[PDB]
Each structure stands twice: as C-alpha cells, then as structure tokens.
Write a protein that binds this ligand. Structure first.
Ligand SMILES: Nc1ncnc2c1ncn2[C@H]1O[C@H](COP(=O)(O)OP(=O)(O)OC[C@@H]2O[C@@H](O[C@H]3[C@@H](O)[C@@H](COP(=O)(O)OP(=O)(O)O)O[C@@H]3n3cnc4c(N)ncnc43)[C@@H](O)[C@@H]2O)[C@H](O)[C@@H]1O
Ligand SMILES: Nc1ncnc2c1ncn2[C@H]1O[C@H](COP(=O)(O)OP(=O)(O)OC[C@@H]2O[C@@H](O[C@H]3[C@@H](O)[C@@H](COP(=O)(O)OP(=O)(O)O)O[C@@H]3n3cnc4c(N)ncnc43)[C@@H](O)[C@@H]2O)[C@H](O)[C@@H]1O
Ligand SMILES: [Cl-]
Ligand SMILES: [Mg+2]
Ligand SMILES: [Mg+2]
Ligand SMILES: [Mg+2]
Ligand SMILES: [Mg+2]
Ligand code: NA
Ligand code: NA
Lengths: 176, 175
C-alpha cells in the first residue's frame, strides 16, 4: 500500500496533512461468558460507507498536528473527547494517502474503559452525528467457533485508505 | 437464502426456528455538507461476528407471537427507547430461508423517535456483547461515484439483510 514515511520526512513536504486516532480501553467483559473481549476499540462508519478511525484534515489554524486531531475528534464525538488529549507520545505511523499531496498520521490512545463508554454515550450529541459520522462501532477481537466469524469477518468489510492495516499493526505491536 | 409466504412458513414442524428483524427509519430533512439531501435515517448495526445486520433475534416459545419476540429482542438489542413504539404485523415485509426461516420488517418512525433510539442504544443489554454499535445507511452516492451507499454495500452482511435493504429501499419509494 501507500509508502511508510518518517514524521519529519513527511512534515518536510510544503501538502494536505490528515490525522486519525484509535482510542482503545481494556475490557474484562466476556461474550456469552466464554469469549474474551480483552479490549474495547472504537472505530466508526463514515459517510463513505467505509469503516475507519476518528479525526480528520489538519489546516492552517492548527497550532500543531495534535490541535487539529483533538479538534476533529471533538467535532466527530462531542464533549466526551474533552476528557483527554492524544499527545504524539501516542503517534504510531505515517502513510502517503491517495489524495493530491495527502499524508496520513495514525495515533493510538490508551483511555480507560470508564472514559471510553462516555465517548459512545456522548456520540449522538456530536456536531457531525448523522453527517460525516454515521455511527460508532467496536472491533471484535475474539474469533471463534466458525474459525472465520469475529475479527476476520470484520476485516472483510470496507476500510478507509489504510485503516485495516493501521488496525492490524496496533493489534500486533501492542501484543495480542 | 430463498423466499417463502408467512403462513407457509408458520406451517412448519418443531425442528424449525423463526427469527425476526426490523428496518427502522424516519424522514430526515438534513443534508450532507448542506448540499446532499440525506432523505431518511436508516439504522443497521455491527454484530459480534463483524457482519452488518438489522436489530432482532430468535422468537422462541415463551413469547406469545412473532411480533412480541421481535419487540423483546429489539429492546434487549436497542435499549428501552424501542418501547416508545411497537413493530406490529402491519410492519411485516418478507420471509426468507441451518433450519431457520427469517422474517423482515420495516417500521417508519418520527425523526425524533429514531434519534432518541440511538442515544439510549449504548445502555442496551446487548451493547458490547451481542451488538457492537449502531450505524445509519448512507442513501446518497458521492460525486466520485463509488463513495456513499454503493461502497457501504461492499461490507459483509448477515444472511439476506442486503437483499432486505435493497428490497426496502425501492419498495416504499426510498429509491
Ligand atoms: N487511515 C487512513 N489512511 C489514508 N487516508 C485516510 C485514512 N483514514 C481516512 N482517510 C481519508 O482522509 C481524507 C479525508 O477524510 P476525513 O477523515 O473525512 O477528513 P475530514 O473529516 O477532515 O473531512 C473530509 C473532507 O470533507 C469533504 O469536503 C467536501 C466539501 O467540504 C466541499 C469543499 O471541498 P474543498 O476542496 O474546498 O475542501 P479541501 O479538501 O480542499 O480542504 O467538497 C468536498 N468534497 C465532496 N466530495 C468530494 C470528492 N469526491 N472529491 C473531493 N472533494 C469532495 C471531502 O473533500 C473530504 O472527504 C481522505 O478521504 C482519505 O480517504
Ligand atoms: N437478515 C437475515 N437473514 C437470515 N438470517 C439472519 C439475518 N439476520 C440475522 N440472521 C441470523 O439470525 C439468527 C440468529 O439470531 P440473531 O439474529 O443473531 O439474534 P439473536 O440476538 O437471537 O442472536 C442469535 C445468536 O445465536 C445464538 O448463539 C450462537 C452461538 O453462541 C452458537 C453457539 O454454538 P455454535 O458452535 O453453533 O456457534 P456457531 O458455530 O454457529 O457460530 O449458536 C448460535 N449461533 C452462532 N452462529 C450461528 C449461525 N451461523 N447459525 C445459527 N446459529 C448460530 C444466541 O446466543 C445469539 O443471540 C441466525 O444466526 C441467522 O443467521
Ligand atoms: Cl466550524
Ligand atoms: Mg471531521
Ligand atoms: Mg472523518
Ligand atoms: Mg435471543
Ligand atoms: Mg439478542
Ligand atoms: Na473538518
Ligand atoms: Na432530505
């Protein structure tokens, strides 16, 4: 897919910069009792008809990449997002997007389960709800019985740009 | 799957199980970007297997009817905002065919009822467990031509929900 860049290497090009973020939180619940949920991971169904992570374009009124990311999260989720900040400490990888001079920045934030729920809960009151944002979904991590149902089936769905691959890496690296 | 009449499908042996699901929808005067008219908000959901489907579940013997069994599953899967209405036999659509025959419904609500339904749908009993969240079908197609609804239909669905969506979009002039 799109070439993997360094931050500064990509930051060098004077271009459209777009940041998205995976909010996760640890999950002691079990499906049916049997199945481990492990973590609760927040994606969203976009206006595209594709699955993906929240956030969006970085503009000229953004003091830093983070400012725009944290801005585009509040737009898409409402004021549950104002309980945290995704801090570049969270920055994971960059990819050259299919748009005219479009780099894509991927973040991953560890929230607590108690913060994460209130995001879902405040999502109908969001500014872009039923507009850019159609609906928040969780990611299934368990994959069982069928040997195909669960996560694998989930990843057969459509994903925006590089979200599938961003999602896979986060599961690998942050050990599963 | 393969179509059948309702009575035909009610005339069946003890080894058969029945399952009910309902397409909820409401008129929407809003527009995407203040330009693309939206039309209706049509709720679908992310299942435990990552297959896109409609609210609903098995009828089972303990519910008095198919409608009851739908409405109960609907309050479990969607939360207590589904108690604001009740999806009757006059909201039934079709019956399709392991040994199961699946019934599909379409219920037209207010915009305010359907919006109130999304807010409470995280407090639902099956949220996190059975259901992993709610979504709206985009009905528009974007100027690129691929985007919008067509790209939403590229997703992997459960049983015949796709057929049932495409059916429900044309059949009451949502297309
Ligand atoms: N992991 C990933 N990996 C990779 N790329 C990823 C990834 N995740 C997401 N992306 C996506 O991230 C980009 C933007 O997506 P978003 O996440 O939604 O960012 P966002 O929330 O800040 O805003 C979205 C934009 O809003 C729209 O704007 C309207 C409107 O303002 C109006 C005015 O447009 P302007 O040209 O004046 O706006 P500017 O773009 O110039 O600022 O027309 C736009 N529009 C409508 N249809 C089209 C079209 N077919 N082609 C181009 N533009 C279109 C679109 O241009 C954009 O999709 C690409 O779509 C790319 O696919
Ligand atoms: N449009 C549609 N058109 C048509 N069919 C449709 C449509 N939409 C949904 N369906 C499906 O609605 C039926 C099930 O009801 P649901 O719609 O999911 O609503 P519901 O809330 O009652 O949930 C049914 C679930 O199924 C039950 O448990 C599972 C699981 O634990 C499992 C436990 O043992 P297994 O080893 O068999 O698990 P699997 O190997 O089967 O995955 O038994 C149930 N189950 C799991 N997978 C399947 C399958 N492919 N076919 C039939 N039953 C299945 C209940 O505990 C759950 O509630 C059929 O699975 C059917 O495929
Ligand atoms: Cl604004
Ligand atoms: Mg946005
Ligand atoms: Mg977006
Ligand atoms: Mg059930
Ligand atoms: Mg259920
Ligand atoms: Na924006
Ligand atoms: Na409209």
């Amino acid at each position: 897919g799109a070439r993997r860049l360094e931050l500064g290497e990509a930051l060098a090009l004077g271009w459209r910069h777009v940041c998205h973020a995976l909010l996760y939180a640890p999950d002691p619940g079990m499906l049916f009792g049997r199945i481990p949920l492990r973590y609760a991971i927040l994606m969203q169904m976009r206006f595209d008809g594709r699955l993906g992570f929240p956030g969006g374009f970085v503009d000229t009124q953004d003091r830093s990449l983070e400012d725009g990311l944290n801005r585009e999260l509040r737009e898409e989720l409402g004021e549950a997002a104002a309980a945290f900040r995704v801090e570049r400490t969270d920055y994971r990888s960059s990819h050259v997007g299919s748009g005219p001079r479009v780099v894509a920045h991927f973040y991953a934030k560890r929230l607590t389960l108690e913060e994460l729920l209130a995001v879902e809960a405040g999502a109908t009151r969001a500014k872009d709800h039923g507009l850019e944002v159609l609906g928040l979904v969780r990611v299934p991590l368990y994959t069982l019985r069928d040997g195909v149902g669960g996560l694998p089936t989930f990843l057969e769905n459509s994903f925006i740009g590089s979200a599938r691959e961003q999602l896979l890496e986060a599961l690998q690296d942050l050990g599963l």
